Amino acid sequence: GVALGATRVIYPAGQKQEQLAVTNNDENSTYLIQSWVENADGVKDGRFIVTPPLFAMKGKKENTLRILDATNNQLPQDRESLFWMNVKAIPSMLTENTLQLAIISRIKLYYRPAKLALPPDQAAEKLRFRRSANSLTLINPTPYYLTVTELNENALVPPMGESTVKDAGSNITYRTINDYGALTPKMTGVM
């Protein structure tokens, strides 16, 4: 099977390109790898260009995809902007009667402006909460897309936005997945 080198990709504005590794751990097989970017609405609007859009992997190898900013600088420059990287691995081989399977790895592609005020190290620590009888509202005052998980459903709270999740209790804890697809320490919710 083939995997990507990351769970997410941060694209700093001004950067000409970014790399993303693709690895076929199997030496006895061949895949066709077709990858493309979509926007927050899953529409392939071509704001970001992936090369190569389509290429073959035969056996134990590692290829590198290149993601190029072609937004013409028209994305918001005050806050992150969400996109999706989609890399589709398609097997290629015959005995009859089988289910053939292709795999899609879909990861977040964050367009991050420059000269941002709040360092990314300390963004999660700003998460605020608003309980409502049967619904908890998470408030994210940061220009960063906050990814809340182990919140006691998960939540992706957009920058300068909010996000609501549906006999719940009182005290609340959470943590987040940082730029390194890794987990921040646990934190206590604040109203």
């Binding site: 099977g1 083939v2 995997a3 990507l4 080198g5 990351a6 769970t7 997410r8 690895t23 751990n25 199997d26 006895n28 097989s29 589709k88 691995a89 097997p91 081989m93 005995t95 009859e96 009667n97 089988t98 289910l99 053939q100 399977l101 292709a102 795999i103 899609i104 790895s105 879909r106 990861i107 977040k108 990814t147 998980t149 998960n154 992706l156 997945i177 730029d179 390194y180 697809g181 890794a182 987990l183």
Partner: protein, 145 residues
């Protein structure tokens, strides 16, 4: 500070394939008839168990017809394929899975030192089955948190 990498996905066979066995057409006589189900495991390897467990997965595929959207169309043959039969994918519990972007949580287990998810596949009758090659395709989609 090192970034987490995504999982390498596998599906039993190395050709991402699943043997559905013969199609006993006399046993697929009418709509709703079903073959016995063959199990297969999807494996998420070489990734933090947190990334795998946290991920959300689904199955995509073209339905056999507008009438049965949770059943896969058969891959069409040159000689012609079986008719009024499709492939259906079930969860660990024999329940059939939809075939749209309707994603759900992976529920991976560190069974076999690696994060694996069980599934099943069977034939679903749509009318009287008629002999024919009965291959089928489907995209598994893994979306990462």
């Amino acid at each position: 500070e090192v970034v987490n990498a995504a999982c390498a996905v596998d599906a039993g066979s190395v050709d991402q394939t699943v043997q559905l066995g013969q199609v006993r057409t006399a046993s697929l006589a009418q709509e709703g008839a079903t073959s016995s189900a063959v199990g297969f495991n999807i494996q998420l390897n070489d990734c933090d168990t947190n990334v795998a467990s946290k991920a959300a997965v689904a199955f995509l595929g073209t339905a056999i017809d507008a009438g049965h959207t949770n059943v896969l169309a058969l891959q069409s043959s040159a000689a012609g394929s079986a008719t009024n039969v499709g492939v259906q994918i079930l969860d660990r519990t024999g329940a059939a899975l939809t075939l749209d972007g309707a994603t759900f949580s992976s529920e991976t287990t560190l069974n076999n030192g690696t994060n694996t998810i069980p599934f099943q596949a069977r034939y679903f009758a749509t009318g009287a089955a008629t002999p024919g090659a009965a291959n089928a395709d489907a995209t598994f989609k893994v979306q990462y948190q």
